[PDB]
Curated annotation (Swiss-Prot), chain A:
It is an enzyme of class 3 (hydrolase). GO terms for molecular function: endopeptidase activity; peptidase activity; threonine-type endopeptidase activity. Component of the 20S core proteasome complex involved in the proteolytic degradation of most intracellular proteins. This complex plays numerous essential roles within the cell by associating with different regulatory particles. Associated with two 19S regulatory particles, forms the 26S proteasome and thus participates in the ATP-dependent degradation of ubiquitinated proteins. GO terms for biological process: proteasome assembly; proteasome-mediated ubiquitin-dependent protein catabolic process; proteolysis; response to oxidative stress. This is Proteasome subunit beta type-5. Keywords: Cytoplasm, Host-virus interaction, Hydrolase, Nucleus, Protease, Proteasome, Threonine protease, Zymogen.
From Swiss-Prot, chain E:
Coiled coil: none annotated. Non-catalytic component of the 20S core proteasome complex involved in the proteolytic degradation of most intracellular proteins. This complex plays numerous essential roles within the cell by associating with different regulatory particles. Associated with two 19S regulatory particles, forms the 26S proteasome and thus participates in the ATP-dependent degradation of ubiquitinated proteins. It is linked to Neurodevelopmental disorder with microcephaly, hypotonia, and absent language: An autosomal recessive disorder characterized by microcephaly, intellectual disability with absent speech, severe developmental delay, short stature, and hypotonia. Affected individuals also manifest aggressive behavior and have hearing loss. GO terms for cellular component: cytoplasm; cytosol; extracellular exosome; extracellular region; ficolin-1-rich granule lumen; nucleoplasm; nucleus; proteasome complex. This is Proteasome subunit beta type-1. GO terms for biological process: proteasome-mediated ubiquitin-dependent protein catabolic process; proteolysis involved in protein catabolic process. It comes from Homo sapiens (Human). The modification Phosphotyrosine is found at residue 122.
From Swiss-Prot, chain F:
The keyword Cytoplasm applies. Keywords: Cytoplasm, Host-virus interaction, Hydrolase, Nucleus, Protease, Proteasome, Threonine protease, Zymogen. GO terms for biological process: proteasome-mediated ubiquitin-dependent protein catabolic process. It is an enzyme of class 3 (hydrolase). This is Proteasome subunit beta type-7. GO terms for cellular component: cilium; cytoplasm; cytosol; extracellular region; ficolin-1-rich granule lumen; nuclear body; nucleoplasm; nucleus. It is found in: Cytoplasm; Nucleus. Component of the 20S core proteasome complex involved in the proteolytic degradation of most intracellular proteins. This complex plays numerous essential roles within the cell by associating with different regulatory particles. Associated with two 19S regulatory particles, forms the 26S proteasome and thus participates in the ATP-dependent degradation of ubiquitinated proteins. Belongs to the peptidase T1B family. It comes from Homo sapiens. It catalyses: Cleavage of peptide bonds with very broad specificity. The active site is at residue 1.
UniProtKB/Swiss-Prot annotation, chains G, I:
Induction: Down-regulated by IFNG/IFN-gamma (at protein level). Up-regulated in anaplastic thyroid cancer cell lines. The modification Phosphothreonine is found at residue 35. It catalyses: Cleavage of peptide bonds with very broad specificity. The active site is at 1 (nucleophile). It comes from Homo sapiens (Human). This is Proteasome subunit beta type-6. Its main location: cytoplasm. Component of the 20S core proteasome complex involved in the proteolytic degradation of most intracellular proteins. This complex plays numerous essential roles within the cell by associating with different regulatory particles. Associated with two 19S regulatory particles, forms the 26S proteasome and thus participates in the ATP-dependent degradation of ubiquitinated proteins. GO terms for cellular component: cytoplasm; cytosol; extracellular exosome; mitochondrion; nucleoplasm; nucleus; proteasome complex; proteasome core complex. GO terms for biological process: proteasome-mediated ubiquitin-dependent protein catabolic process. The keyword tRNA-binding does not apply. Keywords: Acetylation, Cytoplasm, Host-virus interaction, Hydrolase, Nucleus, Phosphoprotein, Protease, Proteasome, Threonine protease, Zymogen.
Length: 201, 124, 215, 204, 213, 220, 191, 199, 191, 199
């Protein structure tokens, strides 16, 4: 499992793999680990597959009620704070959750990191998963705030490919989204076996 | 626990305990407020001072946050407990969504607190 | 029940043409000690169903009490309705599962035989809440010993008469007397038909010991 | 567990007058590959190979103890070793560590040298030989390889269809395993020549 | 002490088609080293267009079926229509997560037709995560069946092989052959093979014998 | 695993199945479980399959050494005494459950040896996982001094009870009949269970698999 | 499992059941627990099956070599002293409930008891095994000084019949043996 | 695990902490802030495990802001620190005890500057200087070596400069950057974010 | 510790020892284990001392309130049903070995047994306690159908005398009680 | 726990390690040396617990120096590395197994440069580049990002420069200094002790 997210001048780029294992047995290769909370928010999946699927679908319920009462959409910092409080009431009972929250805000881009233990931090770049440490090194090299859009795609696309190459629990296909001004736009979804021929030559 | 319906309907369609409480407002001292385009100005009249009292414990303009002021009329004993319940809510908004409280939000909290309180059991 | 104190042993049961026959012995063990040697482990529920049980015997007298009251109160309604054997089998399955979920199970294993509306019913109920139906059942070590003897007849001959079924049980009760340390040579045979529920007396097996002279 | 520390998979399959063996290429420590060229099939004379899978220490340890005992055999006797004879030799080596056991499961495949007849067998980690007539498998992803071989094996197969069957048996099963992969090498032997091929697998 | 779980075996299989859906399972109930019965299929017909298969701890499988069938009636008595296949999957994920800290030991696969008459397969974990797939296999012999359907249905790891969609005829014999291979190597894979076929006209059923070790 | 033996009016009939189950997966479909000891004594093995192989070869090596020195026929009590003295020495760390049977000068003799070293002479024994199922066929239908046609029918019936009722058993039934003058070892006595025929043609052709690198090396 | 030995003036009388269990399954249904060592010396064994079969063979080895060397029939006290030395030195590794009884020309019938500790004592009558606890009260009241041989065969038949019926680990058939100067009379009894 | 420091002078309190938000072996964020305001002259510096440092310290922050609105004046640093000690001690013998280590810094117009010390067992200590984390073992010995009760705030900064350079010599963690505050009669003031260039 | 009850035609006969131990020290040397509930209904208790004293007081509370309400002497089966409901509901918290015996006008003498599980059964004679295992074989052979009262006083005296002498936890003095239609005759016996 | 790296080129092997000898929380020595010569063209780089890295690696050193005196020529890097694997594997199932992680670097005049990889379970691996320690998780992904089999030794140094600057950005340990060797046909050569000024 390997997810990453980084913000730059033209919004936020989110990428992930698609392999979900069960012990040494691979259950599936087509697991969508970047679930779509809203047309204006995104959330990742790391750790508990059903723990991240439930509590972020429960978050999408809560953000909709906020819009119907206040007649504007919730900010990214407020949305992460609601998620961090719901998880905290089951602290010690054994929830596995390491997600990230992305989205455009009135203050510009937004990128937050929520653990199941109660961590809530902002930042510029993040990488979550079993093969996350394989993603930091290749992402720290080619990162700039002033990247172009086609260059930011090929950065985050190859960075997942270097993590799936070393990690045994990561693989499948490379999903890739782009959080923009108005909302998120799905970029691509490339197979690793197709990228292996691309990046070798 | 005292369970009794206080506010009920009239045979023609009124809530008598509501509109009796509106006449308790109609003999409290006058509070006037206008808004400018850059500076709001509101000021109560009839301080009704008797020159032997502390002038600050008789004030009827308080603040709920740094940005939200509040004046009232009616009877003062019911006022300063609605205010103290509004101070908790506008503070609990900041532990939630990070911005300070919009002035429309704190009116919806006071108005919805006041409606459901004309609906419960054993409460004027 | 965390630890069963006084336990029973294997209970057999098999269908035949027009009824179910169930046999079980009359011993309540306590560890390796045979204390209570005249107890009855078969309850005759009202007229078309019948219950035997293994496991903890104090929990069996509880279910003997609860199922007794559920039959007494219905029959004084005058509805013309009674519980079918699979209605009791469905109730008792829910009673097991709703009690292991509170981590406080009834240490039993129960066989429900019944003949209602022209056909036979034979149901299994586990401590964990596992229930199924079969033409022949066996609990305990009878699931290892007597159960292969039941299936090798029912595969070569699917339908059995009452005398063929009653003969086939007493052979299986004989084998459990030889190869089980918790058995006892005193059992009773219960049988439902269209006529009703009948329980026979403390029958006994006849043993063979001719191989003891072989050094 | 212990066998899941490094992964690995070895398959052998019997044909008409020929026999093929295949293995993966990954070397790693529980999540983390190190190299993709780790040797797991070792030659023991002409037309007779052995495959090893299990703990990466005992793969390199048994393959050197066995070669130590093999060259002493082929010099004290003037002939090459029969495939049935080596099965008793390997089973003796593993049973000496009855209480200190090596964590590997060998697979032996080769042709009998005089009458060119194929031979396959497999052993557990304390030396119980099991000869078959269709296929033997060993490694972590064992159950995925039974579903391949029980569904694809035919009795009398030329070396062309023997290669295509064992290739599809390895590529589909090892892709379903997590700790095994990174390439598959296939040795297919026969009485006149021998063939080493590497397959185009997922480097994922 | 009293362990509240046991493993009762079972192996289920679902394949989504273009206008059909095929759900199959064995009929063996067995724990330990013994056999309880040789007739206990896992094909449960929910609606005329939705069939679920439930493997694992058998006490939970009896309980979870009866919880589901009550809520299909409560939906209809509150909304005047039957549930769709995607609505059953969204309901079941809340049911399984509702016992997050004492879970059901059940693997679930829902097969059936969607609103457009196409196949749909929803596979579950024992916690309540799910996704829509084209073919899944769960239970005891799930690790044997999933590689074989990648090669045939998924057309994976092959070169210069055409990509024809699976017909109803081809999918029957492909199901019937993959259980014969699983019956040889798995001790839990049973004796009779119940196959339930969901089409636009109803649900057909079919029984195929196997070996009986 | 299901092994059994009986003593009829002239000799001894032994029987077994052919399955080795590693974990819960069938590893071998034709594993032979009846072993050679002498030209008159055989043994069936159960338990750890590696411990029973290396034990039954050690004793059969010593009895070939013993009988070739004395120049006469081995006895069944010698193989009993060698086995239970060495299993007691290893304190039960060697898991080996054996059914020992043979016809020496004194007649037919059937033993059962437990992996701690306890033995017993009995007219009929069953060992293995599905031994309780096979005992019930013996316990219902044994009669002293049967003919060998009645004995072979009895043992194959008892092994079949361990086939259709035990998970870790069930394939072709082996038998062996030892008498004073005849040794009929025969592995496929009956085939109770087959494999079903394939229906869908899965056949691939040459060129459907991508190859990175090929090498050809000739031999002679 | 349930073993018993009673002496009378001319000799001793032994008895045991025939059930051998493995937890709760009846492995051996009929079992000879009366093991000969010499022509007039028996032992009846209980506890672990693999231990007491191995110990009784080594004592028969050492006592048979001892008597052929002196050229003289061995003493019952000599045979009971040999079980003591093996059961005490290996007391951390054995589960032995041996009762040694037999006739001797110098002293007549003797009965010795070696329990799981490794001690040794002579008794008028001995009793051991798992099922022996349920007939302590019977064997105390019913025992009478100065019995004949035929009364002791009755006295060991009634006592073993009660422990077999009450205990679950005992059962099977009753094996008896009467050792005198004249010889050994073995019989198999049921009832 | 991570470090903060409490030098207190005659009419000021000099506090500083690190900026590193850690993880398993990596550092997620390099410019984290351990500093929480409650009033114009009271800070709060919290150290501990993941969830409790964030939510306890902002639970206190909403109770101090509420006290100012209900009354019109602020808490003293003595009373604000002593309100916190009651909240750990009551929640200590509970199903969920908070595991945080903290020290509070405050100025008052009556008793001047003040520094308090707490732990995860809620024991107060009025101290002239204190520290938490594993760096406290390295750095307390420099600090009582050179402490004068009459120390000026210019040389108190370079004492803190000396107290952190030793922490990047014989301490195995990374810790490159340090954020510094100062509290006086004029309130909170941000000082220079002192750091050491790893280029 | 060692308790026993035998019925005859006119009534029942009870008996118990008097030793109460605390591990291996004799705390109470003489002890009354025969607890009255009503005028014709006794119980003899074993197991935990603190449990069976607390249970026997609550049953006496509930049965005395029950009989004064019907204005009718209670049944022995009614009193045994009350111990069953407390020993089964609190079976995870009690160690009770209660034997309920007594005379009734409608049915005569009855003997009921409630062991530590919480079941209930009627017997011709009951026996319980730690020392009761050593006189199972005696009480099976010696028991004879159709005894008088004086034979049952002999039959419970000889049986308790054997368990007291053989077990270490039993001992002290023998307490007896004969419940008939006429009344209760209690005596303290030694020998 | 501590780091070393193995870039191997066409006619050279570039190795580097850290210089920190650690303790409980402090660092005892800042210029430790993890580098052990055996021949003029064979090095050894050992990582592990306290006693075993020193004494095992000099046990091997006295056996390689002995082989040169008994015969007049040196071991190949293949044979020298494969002699070490026999010594861990034989001492593995013992009363005292050594717990060391190592990688060996060597040049030969027949097969050119060579790099081998081992662990505390004695598994060999002929690798083009390798690393030990927790820094290997951070730094292998940069290294296969930019590796060419035909890489010149001037740009291989600045690849190592890039591979260590990321290690001082997202790794919680200190690790300021790194000692660098290079092996070629002319033998061992010391390169610049590259480091990062913490002033």
């Amino acid at each position: 499992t390997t997810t990453l997210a980084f913000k730059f001048r033209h919004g936020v780029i989110v990428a992930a793999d698609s392999r979900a294992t069960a012990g040494a047995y691979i259950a599936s290769q087509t697991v969508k680990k970047v679930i779509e909370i809203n047309p204006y928010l995104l959330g990742t999946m790391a750790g508990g597959a059903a723990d991240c699927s439930f509590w972020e679908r429960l978050l999408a319920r809560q953000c909709r009620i906020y819009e119907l009462r206040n007649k504007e959409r919730i900010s990214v910092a407020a949305a992460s704070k609601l998620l961090a409080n719901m998880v905290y009431q089951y602290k010690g009972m054994g929830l596995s959750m390491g997600t990230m929250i992305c989205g455009w805000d009135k203050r510009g881009p937004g990128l937050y990191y929520v653990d199941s233990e109660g961590n809530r931090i902002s930042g510029a770049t993040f990488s979550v998963g079993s093969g996350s440490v394989y993603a930091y090194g290749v992402m720290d090299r080619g990162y700039s705030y002033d990247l172009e859009v086609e260059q930011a795609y090929d950065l985050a696309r190859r960075a997942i490919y270097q993590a799936t190459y070393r990690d045994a629990y990561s693989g499948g296909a490379v999903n890739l989204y782009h959080v923009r001004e108005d909302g998120w736009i799905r970029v691509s979804s490339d197979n690793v076996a197709d990228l292996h021929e691309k990046y070798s030559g | 626990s005292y369970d009794r319906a206080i506010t009920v309907f009239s045979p023609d369609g009124h809530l008598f305990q509501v509109e009796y409480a509106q006449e308790a407002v109609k003999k409290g001292s006058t509070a006037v407020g206008v808004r400018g385009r850059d500076i709001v100005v509101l000021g109560v009249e009839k301080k009704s001072v008797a020159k032997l009292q502390d002038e600050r414990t008789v004030r009827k303009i308080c603040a709920l946050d740094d940005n939200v002021c509040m004046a009232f009329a009616g009877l003062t004993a019911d006022a300063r407990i609605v205010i103290n319940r509004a101070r908790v809510e506008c503070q609990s908004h900041r532990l939630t969504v990070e911005d300070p409280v919009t002035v429309e939000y704190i009116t919806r909290y006071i108005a919805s607190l006041k409606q459901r309180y004309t609906q419960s059991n054993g409460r004027r | 029940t965390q630890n069963p104190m006084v336990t029973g042993t294997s209970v057999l049961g098999v269908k035949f043409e027009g009824g179910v026959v169930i046999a079980a012995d009359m011993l309540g063990s306590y560890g390796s000690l045979a204390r209570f040697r005249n107890i009855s482990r078969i309850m005759r529920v009202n007229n078309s169903t019948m219950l035997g049980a293994s496991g903890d015997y104090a929990d069996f007298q509880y279910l003997k009490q609860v199922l007794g009251q559920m039959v007494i109160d219905e029959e004084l309604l005058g509805d013309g309705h009674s519980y079918s054997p699979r209605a009791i089998h469905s109730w008792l399955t829910r009673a097991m599962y709703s009690r292991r979920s509170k981590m406080n199970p009834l240490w039993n294993t129960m066989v429900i035989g019944g003949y209602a509306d022209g056909e036979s019913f034979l149901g299994y109920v586990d401590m964990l809440g596992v229930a199924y139906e079969a033409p022949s059942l066996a609990t305990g070590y009878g699931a290892y010993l007597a159960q292969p003897l039941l299936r090798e007849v029912l595969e070569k001959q699917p339908v059995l008469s009452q005398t063929e079924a009653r003969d086939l049980v007493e052979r299986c009760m004989r084998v459990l007397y030889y190869r089980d340390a918790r058995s006892y040579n005193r059992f009773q045979i219960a049988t439902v038909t269209e006529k009703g529920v009948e329980i026979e007396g403390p029958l006994s097996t006849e043993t063979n010991w001719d191989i003891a002279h072989m050094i | 567990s212990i066998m899941s520390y490094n992964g690995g998979a070895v398959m052998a399959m019997k044909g008409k007058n020929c026999v093929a063996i295949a293995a993966d290429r990954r070397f790693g420590i529980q999540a983390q590959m190190v190299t993709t060229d780790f040797q797991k099939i070792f030659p023991m004379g002409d037309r007779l190979y052995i495959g090893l899978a299990g703990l990466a220490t005992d793969v390199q340890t048994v393959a050197q103890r066995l070669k130590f005992r093999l060259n002493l055999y082929e010099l004290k006797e003037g002939r090459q070793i029969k495939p049935y004879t080596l099965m008793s030799m390997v089973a003796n080596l593993l049973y000496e560590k009855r209480f200190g056991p090596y964590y590997t499961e060998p697979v032996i495949a080769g042709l009998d040298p005089k009458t060119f007849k194929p031979f396959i067998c497999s052993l557990d980690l304390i030396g119980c030989p099991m000869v078959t007539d269709d296929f033997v498998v060993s490694g972590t992803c064992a159950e995925q390889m039974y579903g391949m071989c029980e569904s694809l094996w035919e009795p009398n197969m030329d070396p062309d269809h023997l290669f295509e069957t064992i290739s599809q048996a390895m590529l589909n099963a090892v892709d379903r395993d997590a700790v095994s992969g990174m390439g598959v090498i296939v040795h297919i032997i026969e009485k006149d020549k021998i063939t080493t091929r590497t397959l185009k697998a997922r480097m994922d | 002490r009293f362990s509240p779980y046991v493993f009762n075996g079972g192996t289920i299989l679902a394949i989504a088609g273009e206008d059909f859906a095929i759900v199959a399972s064995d009929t063996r109930l067995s724990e330990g080293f013994s056999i309880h019965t040789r007739d206990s299929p896992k094909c449960y017909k929910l609606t005329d267009k939705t069939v679920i298969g439930c493997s694992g701890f058998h006490g939970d499988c009896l309980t979870l079926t009866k919880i589901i069938e009550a809520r299909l009636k409560m939906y209809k008595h509150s909304n005047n229509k039957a549930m769709t296949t995607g609505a059953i999957a969204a309901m079941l994920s809340t049911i399984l997560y509702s016992r997050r800290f004492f879970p059901y030991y059940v693997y679930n696969i829902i097969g059936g037709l969607d609103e457009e008459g196409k196949g749909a397969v929803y596979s579950f974990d024992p916690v309540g995560s799910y996704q829509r797939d084209s073919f899944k296999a769960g239970g005891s012999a799930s690790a044997m069946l999933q590689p074989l359907l990648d090669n045939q249905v998924g057309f994976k790891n092959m070169q210069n092989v055409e990509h024809v969609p699976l017909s109803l005829d081809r999918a029957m014999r492909l199901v019937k052959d993959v259980f014969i291979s699983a019956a040889e190597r798995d001790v839990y894979t049973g004796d009779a093979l119940r196959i339930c076929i969901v089409t636009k006209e109803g649900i057909r059923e079919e029984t195929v014998s196997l070996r009986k070790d | 695993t299901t092994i059994a033996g009986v003593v009829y009016k002239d000799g001894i009939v032994l029987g077994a199945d052919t399955r080795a189950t590693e974990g819960m997966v069938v590893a071998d479909k034709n594993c032979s479980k009846i072993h050679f000891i002498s030209p008159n004594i055989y043994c069936c093995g159960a338990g750890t399959a590696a411990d029973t192989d290396m034990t039954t070869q050690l004793i059969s090596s010593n009895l070939e050494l013993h009988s070739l020195s004395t120049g006469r026929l081995p006895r069944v009590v010698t193989a009993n005494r060698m086995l239970k003295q060495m299993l007691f020495r290893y304190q039960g760390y060697i898991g080996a459950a054996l059914v020992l049977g043979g016809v020496d000068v004194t007649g037919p003799h059937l033993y059962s040896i437990y992996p701690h070293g306890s033995t017993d002479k009995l007219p009929y024994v069953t060992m293995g996982s599905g031994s309780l199922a096979a005992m019930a066929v013996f316990e219902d239908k044994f009669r002293p001094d049967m003919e060998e046609e009645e004995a072979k029918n009895l043992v194959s019936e008892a092994i079949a009870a361990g086939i259709f009722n035990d998970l870790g058993s069930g394939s072709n039934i082996d038998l062996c009949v030892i008498s004073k003058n005849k040794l009929d070892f025969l592995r496929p006595y009956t085939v109770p269970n087959k494999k079903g025929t394939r229906l869908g043609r899965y056949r691939c052709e040459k060129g459907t698999t991508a190859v990175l690198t090929e090498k050809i090396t000739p031999l002679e | 499992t349930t073993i018993m030995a009673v002496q009378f003036d001319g000799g001793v009388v032994l008895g045991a059941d025939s059930r051998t269990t493995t937890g709760s399954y009846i492995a051996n249904r009929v079992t000879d627990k009366l093991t000969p060592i010499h022509d007039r010396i028996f032992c009846c064994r209980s506890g672990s099956a693999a231990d007491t079969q191995a110990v009784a063979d080594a004592v028969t080895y050492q006592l048979g070599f001892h008597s052929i060397e002196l050229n003289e029939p061995p003493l019952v006290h000599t045979a009971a002293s040999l079980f003591k030395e093996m059961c005490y030195r290996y007391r951390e590794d054995l589960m032995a409930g041996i009762i040694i009884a037999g006739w001797d020309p110098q002293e007549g019938g003797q009965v010795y008891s070696v329990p799981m500790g490794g001690m040794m004592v002579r008794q008028s009558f001995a009793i051991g095994g798992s099922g022996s606890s349920y007939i302590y009260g019977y064997v105390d009241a019913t025992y009478r000084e100065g019995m004949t041989k035929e009364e002791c065969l009755q006295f060991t038949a009634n006592a073993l019949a009660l422990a077999m019926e009450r205990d679950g680990s005992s059962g099977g058939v009753i094996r008896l043996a009467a050792i005198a100067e004249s010889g050994v009379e073995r019989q198999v009894l049921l009832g | 695990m991570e470090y903060l420091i409490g030098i207190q002078g005659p009419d000021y309190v000099l506090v500083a902490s690190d900026r590193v938000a850690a993880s398993n072996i990596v550092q997620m964020k390099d410019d984290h802030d351990k500093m929480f305001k409650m009033s114009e002259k009271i800070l709060l510096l919290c150290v501990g495990e993941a969830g409790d440092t964030v939510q306890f310290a902002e639970y206190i922050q909403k109770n101090v802001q509420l006290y100012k609105m209900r009354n019109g004046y602020e808490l003293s640093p003595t009373a604000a620190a002593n309100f916190t000690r009651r909240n750990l001690a009551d929640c200590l013998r509970s199903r969920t005890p908070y595991h945080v280590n903290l020290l509070l810094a405050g100025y008052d117009e009556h008793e001047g500057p003040a520094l308090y010390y707490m732990d995860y067992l809620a024991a107060l200590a009025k101290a002239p200087f204190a520290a938490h984390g594993y760096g406290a073992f390295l750095t307390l010995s420099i600090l009582d070596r050179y402490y004068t009760p009459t120390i000026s705030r210019e040389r108190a900064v370079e004492l803190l400069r000396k107290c952190l350079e030793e922490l990047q010599k014989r301490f195995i963690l990374n810790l490159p950057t340090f954020s510094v505050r100062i509290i006086d009669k004029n309130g909170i003031h941000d000082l220079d974010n002192i750091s050491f260039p790893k280029q």
